[PDB]
Design a protein around this ligand. Structure first.
Ligand code: NA
Length: 130
């Protein structure tokens, strides 16, 4: 599923992401925007280390979900990576919350540092009623 901007913003707020571990909704929106373009079925293989990024938040198989083919991997979210490819983003959100519970927080995703950190992220939620 490819979410429309405001539709996703309202969905994320209802799922309790606004201010989770100090992360504003606009930051989560910026992250999903640059990671997948608000697309839940995106799965990108990383030829370099044999891991794959899954779903709307592009969560990595080496540490967060199990896909069985990633060497020396753990499954901190206790989910099959297939769960992160559903149109219903409840599981992806639960796992995203888990990721940020670690010391790095939102910085765990390099795309956030490149495209969201220290920028005006207001545009991602403007006019969405959240
Ligand atoms: Na894994």
């Amino acid at each position: 599923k490819v979410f429309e901007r405001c539709e996703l913003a309202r969905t994320l707020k209802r799922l309790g992401m606004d201010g989770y571990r100090g992360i504003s909704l606009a930051n989560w929106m910026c992250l999903a925007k640059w990671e997948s373009g608000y697309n839940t079925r995106a799965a990108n293989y990383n030829a370099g280390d044999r891991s794959t990024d899954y779903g709307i938040f592009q969560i990595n198989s080496r540490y967060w979900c199990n896909d069985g083919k990633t060497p020396g991997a753990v499954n901190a979210c206790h989910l099959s990576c297939s769960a992160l490819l559903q149109d219903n983003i409840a599981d992806a959100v639960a796992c995203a919350k888990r990721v940020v519970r670690d010391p790095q927080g939102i910085r765990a995703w390099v795309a956030w540092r490149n495209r969201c950190q220290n920028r005006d992220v207001r545009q991602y939620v403007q006019g969405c009623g959240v």
